[PDB]
RNA sequence: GUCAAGCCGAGGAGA
RNA sequence: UCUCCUCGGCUUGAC
């Protein structure tokens, strides 16, 4: 039933007899289909030889497992073989190693594999080896770089390859390694300023995958072009000539707080260097115990966030953001005040009497349809133009950086009627990150959105970086780029998603940022890498071989050194040689001896002395903890009945017993000293 | 069928 | 060395 194309045949041809190789063709050229044909050929070959053989497909995401368990492998190969798709959300029943030798055609998110490998290498948890396979197939090879996921697998593969080659000249017995087929669209250039460094990068990839060719289509090209096309590029620039009543109204507050602080930014309001200045200022102030300087740092950081979204989003969203923030703040203050406690503050009183007195005003200055936003009006024009031009023949995708962005966009495009009168149904899309003010999403919710859009029930999918790679849509036209430039790969992989006729690509930039600049940079890199590929394809085989062997050895030796600096590198097993203080206030909290651990992940104290100090701010089981001063400390945790209040070290501050170089660490794993697990013998009767 | 929390690794961007 | 964003994975719990 599965049908082929000609160029598919010629590009596949060498892989059909050994030849572990790489492929790169433009998006939507049957890469999956040619892979599927190679699967069928491989296994039929191994059976007609009466030999054993199995296949593992690797992706770098969680949708693609079921994407390709639904649409391309399973519908064609169900008859002759069993198939199974694995991800980070499919509740298995057996384990991974057992299904290595049960279903015979697997598909996996990557890290499942490496987990099982290092389990086989560390303990007796069953695990798996590479000799338990006959073929690895890869999608989106180009992530094979410095310390990525795929790279560890290929490091182990190359190590065993060199062992095989050392046994080539020492013994007869050697292990037959599995074949490797890599697929991509752009192997991509890793930050090279020239054509030659880019060539070197291609060779680094190819040696990190044990390649022999690339096999770009050149012969059967008319077939491609009559069958495949590209969109038309389009730039959309918009400049500001407004924002003096609102934006400057906030820069006013910034100057006011700085003149309350006596601290010079020495840079511009509304950027990242200003942020970094505030961050280091805060870290030093907490390293000094100085209040009045960390706190305006944190607030000015919030104002900078508000400005940076004001570069992208209306006044109203930032008003909402800081409304949530100071709402939480006043909640903490009232919770402290409402707990045999009488005291008042001077800083926080100043900040709040500075803000809330302008809260109503800024809400009044928020709602103004005149200067809503340049880029937003521009996309209104672009969108409505397209969705009027197509007459129900639309399928939309939108990209951006953050998620709060996406939520606001979906909300507001549900609000406005010019978008609803056309009936451009909308929904956003994100990866399962349980960290935001935003409400997170679920895997099943993601898949339902995929199905509703492929159904066409949604007309525009707002998507974060989960949606550059994959999402084999049947046919869509309109894709855009809301003020985002990362590299050449995101550009090309998004610019080729309109798998349909009369496709378009768009960028939406502000003139006050080097964005279209990097647009052109990525364009040049795209032109550059094809020339580099044409160079290496015409390379001599023996010279190619020598170079890839060099780079294999370089990758393996680099691992070893990165291992040498990580043998221990910090092994002071100093249990309680510290004191943890609060960070806002310089209030002592705990020592190291009262601390214990659960699950060898979570660090906690479980003594009444730490108990009778904090407050539980209400929304109910997982409660949030706060300080007496007003600092947030941690979250509750009900572990085996024990109501242990766990915390985050990033909120607290260090003070050693020896000489007190106060520091911040941002996470537990970084620091040297060790804490023990908690024997439950305590807290009994 | 629902929800919450924390931990870790990696990439990209910027400085 | 720092920051931001993003992604993938792992455990605990509650309905
Ligand atoms: N042999 C074939 N004949 C016709 N169309 C094909 C064939 N093989 C694949 N396709 C088309 O290719 C599309 C899949 O492209 P795909 O390779 O998944 O994109 P990407 O390369 O970005 O992963 C499908 O929509 C399908 O219609
Ligand atoms: Mg693909
Ligand atoms: Zn405190």
XYZ file of C-alpha atoms in Angstrom, chain A residues 67-570:
504
model
C 2.147 11.345 15.646
C 4.084 8.590 13.924
C 2.427 5.744 15.814
C -0.870 7.000 14.344
C -0.224 8.186 10.824
C 2.837 6.776 9.042
C 4.347 3.646 10.605
C 1.291 1.907 12.038
C -1.159 2.325 9.109
C 1.309 0.622 6.737
C 3.270 -1.849 8.888
C 0.580 -3.213 11.230
C 0.196 -6.372 9.152
C 3.765 -7.642 9.016
C 4.993 -6.458 12.434
C 3.963 -5.228 15.837
C 4.517 -1.552 16.590
C 4.540 0.556 19.715
C 4.908 4.233 20.532
C 6.346 5.524 23.798
C 6.488 9.006 25.274
C 6.548 10.831 28.590
C 2.804 10.448 29.003
C 1.925 6.889 27.927
C 1.412 4.978 31.158
C 3.315 1.809 30.324
C 2.796 -1.505 32.075
C 5.906 -3.642 31.624
C 9.185 -1.584 31.311
C 11.236 -0.276 28.384
C 13.822 -3.124 28.189
C 11.164 -5.806 27.926
C 9.401 -4.007 25.095
C 12.789 -3.816 23.377
C 12.267 -7.553 22.731
C 8.460 -7.665 22.360
C 6.991 -5.191 19.873
C 9.891 -5.187 17.344
C 9.240 -1.622 16.031
C 9.543 1.019 18.669
C 9.230 4.796 18.725
C 10.538 6.789 21.626
C 11.202 10.113 23.049
C 14.966 10.201 23.368
C 15.832 10.271 27.061
C 13.924 7.040 27.799
C 16.691 5.252 25.931
C 19.659 6.920 27.637
C 17.980 6.372 31.004
C 17.748 2.651 30.346
C 21.331 2.520 29.063
C 22.823 4.169 32.130
C 20.603 1.948 34.269
C 22.154 -1.102 32.617
C 25.577 0.452 33.170
C 25.016 1.631 36.753
C 22.984 -1.034 38.548
C 20.983 -4.189 37.849
C 17.775 -2.375 36.853
C 17.385 -4.370 33.662
C 18.467 -1.748 31.149
C 19.499 -2.305 27.557
C 22.495 -2.239 25.203
C 22.948 -1.137 21.610
C 23.630 -4.738 20.568
C 19.915 -5.325 21.304
C 19.095 -3.541 18.025
C 19.610 -3.704 14.283
C 18.770 -0.122 13.289
C 18.447 3.323 14.823
C 16.503 5.978 12.939
C 16.655 9.647 13.890
C 14.516 12.689 13.212
C 16.014 16.189 13.489
C 19.649 15.120 13.615
C 20.984 18.655 13.908
C 20.507 18.673 17.690
C 23.527 16.360 17.710
C 25.974 18.905 19.128
C 27.716 19.700 22.415
C 26.167 17.616 25.274
C 22.725 17.242 23.711
C 20.577 14.154 24.203
C 21.413 12.253 21.006
C 25.096 13.013 21.462
C 25.495 10.796 24.533
C 24.060 7.830 22.627
C 26.377 8.504 19.725
C 29.369 8.943 22.030
C 28.770 5.446 23.347
C 28.281 4.194 19.796
C 31.548 5.762 18.653
C 33.372 4.377 21.685
C 32.265 0.876 20.785
C 33.154 1.556 17.146
C 36.706 2.420 18.112
C 36.788 -0.720 20.241
C 35.693 -2.707 17.179
C 38.381 -1.054 15.074
C 41.028 -1.745 17.709
C 39.936 -5.375 17.609
C 40.166 -5.198 13.808
C 43.970 -5.359 14.113
C 44.130 -7.393 17.341
C 41.556 -10.204 17.216
C 39.001 -11.762 14.906
C 35.908 -11.569 17.182
C 34.080 -8.242 17.087
C 30.542 -7.000 17.730
C 28.293 -6.086 14.743
C 27.063 -2.600 15.536
C 23.590 -1.432 14.500
C 23.070 0.693 11.437
C 22.223 4.374 11.872
C 20.043 6.502 9.614
C 19.761 10.193 10.373
C 17.106 12.466 8.899
C 16.875 16.241 8.989
C 16.083 19.303 6.866
C 19.069 21.426 7.773
C 22.096 19.991 9.597
C 22.603 23.649 10.344
C 25.664 25.718 11.123
C 26.702 26.131 14.740
C 27.662 29.795 15.021
C 30.215 30.130 12.237
C 31.173 33.492 10.570
C 32.624 31.709 7.515
C 32.018 28.883 5.080
C 34.987 26.851 6.327
C 33.969 26.764 9.988
C 30.522 25.771 8.758
C 32.046 22.879 6.827
C 33.818 21.877 10.029
C 30.450 21.928 11.786
C 28.868 19.676 9.167
C 31.742 17.265 9.611
C 31.256 17.374 13.383
C 27.644 16.313 12.872
C 28.542 13.619 10.370
C 31.181 12.147 12.666
C 28.761 12.340 15.584
C 26.494 10.028 13.539
C 29.001 7.742 11.759
C 28.004 8.962 8.321
C 29.151 8.191 4.791
C 27.055 10.598 2.672
C 24.409 13.304 2.810
C 22.555 12.662 -0.479
C 20.788 15.866 -1.340
C 18.367 15.522 -4.231
C 19.762 16.948 -7.460
C 18.734 14.596 -10.281
C 14.966 14.229 -9.802
C 14.565 17.925 -9.058
C 11.760 18.801 -11.454
C 9.613 16.218 -9.678
C 10.246 18.067 -6.408
C 9.557 21.511 -7.783
C 6.388 20.594 -9.657
C 5.369 18.784 -6.438
C 6.948 21.122 -3.856
C 7.280 24.894 -3.583
C 8.239 27.577 -1.063
C 6.313 30.532 0.371
C 6.906 34.193 -0.349
C 8.822 36.060 2.321
C 7.281 39.170 3.830
C 8.621 41.767 6.256
C 6.373 43.926 8.424
C 7.985 46.765 10.382
C 6.297 49.122 12.815
C 7.652 52.098 14.759
C 6.323 53.851 17.853
C 5.513 57.556 18.040
C 3.427 57.411 21.226
C 3.454 55.984 24.782
C 4.400 59.226 26.485
C 1.441 59.213 28.990
C 1.831 55.600 30.136
C 5.399 54.422 29.497
C 6.992 57.624 30.765
C 4.490 57.426 33.624
C 6.290 54.223 34.639
C 9.784 55.555 33.966
C 8.727 58.334 36.342
C 8.168 55.732 39.055
C 11.512 54.177 38.143
C 13.331 57.483 38.614
C 11.410 58.067 41.846
C 12.467 54.728 43.295
C 16.066 55.198 42.156
C 16.137 58.604 43.849
C 14.774 56.760 46.878
C 17.699 54.313 46.475
C 20.646 56.429 45.257
C 21.680 53.880 42.628
C 22.639 54.760 39.060
C 21.647 52.265 36.326
C 24.148 53.750 33.863
C 21.962 52.307 31.091
C 18.515 52.477 29.504
C 15.096 51.817 30.995
C 13.389 48.850 29.363
C 16.088 46.368 28.365
C 18.163 43.430 29.609
C 21.399 45.113 30.677
C 19.266 47.098 33.122
C 17.857 43.793 34.349
C 21.288 42.212 34.871
C 22.351 45.326 36.773
C 19.335 44.957 39.050
C 20.065 41.252 39.517
C 23.673 41.686 40.587
C 22.614 44.614 42.773
C 20.037 42.404 44.489
C 22.505 39.559 44.946
C 25.058 41.892 46.509
C 22.471 43.506 48.786
C 21.411 40.072 50.004
C 25.091 39.170 50.371
C 25.430 42.310 52.526
C 22.206 42.089 54.527
C 21.332 45.517 53.099
C 17.613 45.997 52.764
C 16.334 49.029 50.794
C 18.483 47.866 47.839
C 17.446 44.285 47.071
C 13.806 45.241 47.286
C 13.672 48.088 44.826
C 15.859 45.854 42.663
C 13.130 43.213 42.598
C 10.372 45.752 42.025
C 12.283 47.520 39.238
C 12.839 44.073 37.746
C 9.070 43.658 37.698
C 8.694 47.071 36.056
C 11.314 46.082 33.483
C 9.344 42.928 32.728
C 6.274 45.127 32.310
C 8.161 47.348 29.870
C 9.551 44.436 27.877
C 6.059 43.044 27.404
C 5.016 46.612 26.577
C 7.473 46.228 23.696
C 5.120 43.430 22.586
C 1.773 43.812 24.379
C -0.728 46.509 25.343
C -0.604 48.509 28.567
C -3.501 46.493 29.983
C -1.621 43.196 30.172
C 1.261 44.721 32.122
C -1.251 46.456 34.369
C -2.726 43.004 35.011
C 0.738 41.554 35.648
C 1.746 44.076 38.285
C -1.799 43.958 39.670
C -1.300 40.250 40.366
C 2.141 40.953 41.813
C 1.222 43.691 44.273
C -1.977 41.771 45.047
C 0.137 38.862 46.263
C 2.364 41.329 48.103
C -0.474 43.006 50.006
C -1.881 39.547 50.722
C 1.396 38.560 52.368
C 1.516 41.824 54.305
C -2.026 41.440 55.628
C -1.327 37.793 56.477
C 1.705 38.817 58.534
C -0.165 41.704 60.172
C -3.125 39.402 60.894
C -0.857 37.089 62.924
C 0.243 38.867 68.339
C 2.383 40.976 66.008
C 2.579 44.776 65.891
C 5.081 46.538 63.638
C 5.292 48.753 60.562
C 7.675 49.216 57.646
C 9.020 52.283 55.853
C 10.259 50.939 52.514
C 7.214 48.839 51.612
C 4.911 51.624 52.785
C 6.730 54.003 50.433
C 6.585 51.617 47.473
C 2.903 50.839 47.949
C 1.827 54.432 48.526
C 3.820 55.133 45.351
C 2.076 52.432 43.303
C -1.532 52.032 44.430
C -2.196 55.772 44.252
C -1.441 55.484 40.513
C -3.078 52.062 40.086
C -6.477 53.502 39.125
C -4.808 56.075 36.873
C -2.725 53.511 34.994
C -5.870 51.449 34.555
C -7.380 54.597 33.062
C -4.222 55.143 31.008
C -4.275 51.442 30.077
C -7.501 51.318 28.069
C -6.683 53.389 24.994
C -7.477 51.979 21.517
C -5.491 54.749 19.802
C -1.997 53.347 20.379
C -2.882 49.758 21.194
C 0.325 48.507 19.566
C 1.999 48.922 16.199
C 2.715 45.240 15.541
C -0.741 44.269 16.769
C -2.454 46.545 14.239
C -0.077 45.239 11.576
C -1.000 41.620 12.241
C -4.665 42.618 12.394
C -4.311 43.908 8.843
C -2.274 40.900 7.670
C -4.507 38.270 9.315
C -7.827 39.755 8.218
C -6.450 40.244 4.701
C -5.515 36.568 4.437
C -8.657 35.185 6.067
C -10.828 37.327 3.795
C -8.784 36.318 0.748
C -8.994 32.556 1.301
C -12.725 32.071 2.057
C -12.600 29.128 4.515
C -9.372 27.746 2.957
C -7.219 28.886 5.906
C -5.107 27.074 8.468
C -3.026 29.318 10.700
C 0.077 29.025 12.861
C 1.653 31.728 15.024
C 4.936 31.664 16.935
C 6.397 33.643 19.811
C 8.879 33.353 22.672
C 6.980 33.254 25.954
C 3.635 31.780 27.033
C 2.008 34.731 28.793
C 2.218 36.221 25.307
C 0.278 33.295 23.860
C -2.401 33.365 26.554
C -2.909 37.099 26.056
C -3.074 36.700 22.279
C -5.665 33.929 22.368
C -7.726 35.865 24.921
C -7.666 39.139 22.991
C -8.367 37.497 19.646
C -11.387 35.883 21.262
C -12.325 39.369 22.494
C -12.097 41.398 19.284
C -14.927 40.953 16.792
C -13.078 41.650 13.537
C -11.345 38.311 14.129
C -14.559 36.569 15.203
C -16.712 37.875 12.338
C -14.409 35.992 9.975
C -14.742 33.031 12.338
C -10.998 32.529 12.872
C -11.263 30.165 15.821
C -8.185 30.205 18.022
C -6.224 28.402 20.700
C -2.651 28.501 21.972
C -0.153 25.709 22.573
C 2.740 25.138 24.983
C 4.884 22.423 26.485
C 4.189 20.889 29.881
C 5.975 23.424 32.056
C 4.557 23.690 35.568
C 6.136 27.108 36.185
C 4.258 30.355 35.535
C 1.478 32.562 36.744
C -0.195 31.075 33.656
C -2.348 27.992 34.014
C -0.398 25.014 32.597
C -1.662 22.472 30.089
C -1.819 18.699 29.828
C -0.561 16.290 27.183
C -4.100 15.176 26.366
C -5.099 18.820 25.973
C -2.228 19.288 23.529
C -3.290 16.286 21.458
C -6.893 17.477 21.443
C -5.767 20.853 20.127
C -3.755 19.060 17.430
C -6.826 17.079 16.432
C -9.172 20.070 16.459
C -6.805 22.047 14.245
C -6.138 19.150 11.882
C -9.918 18.915 11.967
C -9.839 22.643 11.245
C -11.911 23.517 14.311
C -9.217 26.072 15.186
C -7.966 28.376 12.430
C -4.823 29.711 14.161
C -2.565 27.759 16.515
C -0.573 30.046 18.768
C 2.497 28.009 19.652
C 5.663 28.340 21.670
C 8.875 26.502 20.775
C 7.159 23.124 21.055
C 5.894 23.741 17.529
C 8.921 24.611 15.413
C 9.748 20.883 14.793
C 7.075 18.358 13.801
C 3.319 18.998 13.458
C 2.850 17.265 10.129
C -0.197 19.275 9.136
C -1.993 18.107 6.003
C -2.189 21.531 4.356
C -1.841 25.071 5.675
C -1.020 28.465 4.175
C -0.439 31.264 6.677
C 2.431 31.212 9.162
C 3.993 34.226 10.868
C 6.799 35.122 13.278
C 5.796 37.527 16.046
C 9.031 39.361 16.736
C 11.284 36.354 17.268
C 14.641 35.413 15.754
C 16.759 32.612 17.229
C 18.809 30.940 14.494
C 18.615 29.733 10.908
C 16.963 26.460 11.864
C 13.840 27.909 13.456
C 13.506 30.199 10.439
C 13.735 27.460 7.830
C 11.708 24.891 9.768
C 8.883 27.357 10.345
C 9.179 28.844 6.844
C 8.418 25.403 5.354
C 5.309 24.349 7.283
C 2.804 25.572 4.697
C 2.549 22.170 3.006
C 0.109 23.622 0.502
C -0.098 25.731 -2.623
C 0.212 29.518 -2.380
C 1.988 29.441 1.037
C 3.369 32.527 2.772
C 5.919 33.425 5.437
C 5.926 36.599 7.517
C 8.092 38.400 10.033
C 6.897 41.149 12.369
C 9.697 43.324 13.756
C 10.079 46.587 15.600
C 12.578 49.000 14.083
C 14.170 49.427 17.522
C 15.766 45.981 17.601
C 18.297 44.147 15.462
C 15.751 41.569 14.332
C 15.447 41.887 10.555
C 19.229 42.102 10.795
C 19.355 38.571 12.170
C 16.720 37.657 9.598
C 19.264 38.493 6.901
C 21.996 36.741 8.897
C 19.992 33.525 8.915
C 19.261 33.957 5.208
C 22.984 34.104 4.493
C 23.665 31.104 6.719
C 21.005 29.196 4.792
C 22.704 30.007 1.499
C 26.066 29.166 3.065
C 25.291 25.701 4.375
C 24.060 24.392 1.025
C 27.341 25.453 -0.563
C 29.223 23.774 2.278
C 27.219 20.587 1.718
C 28.030 20.694 -1.985
C 31.677 21.030 -0.984
C 31.710 17.974 1.267
C 29.644 15.818 -1.100
C 32.455 16.220 -3.635
C 35.041 15.406 -0.957
C 37.260 12.395 -1.465
C 36.123 9.324 0.521
C 39.441 8.609 2.236
C 39.968 12.221 3.310
C 36.378 12.354 4.553
C 37.032 9.155 6.494
C 40.181 10.543 8.100
C 38.451 13.763 9.128
C 35.459 11.999 10.657
C 37.716 9.633 12.593
C 39.527 12.682 13.940
C 36.279 14.303 15.024
C 35.008 11.074 16.594
C 38.159 10.904 18.693
C 37.801 14.586 19.537
C 34.220 14.097 20.702
C 35.188 11.117 22.842
C 38.217 12.816 24.408
C 36.151 15.940 25.073
C 33.690 13.802 27.025
C 36.523 12.358 29.224
C 37.836 15.805 30.147
C 34.290 17.142 30.963
C 34.171 13.942 33.154
C 37.555 14.764 34.698
C 36.233 18.153 35.795
C 33.117 16.330 37.059
C 34.730 13.387 38.880
C 33.901 15.164 42.094
C 35.056 18.803 41.586
C 33.323 19.634 44.904
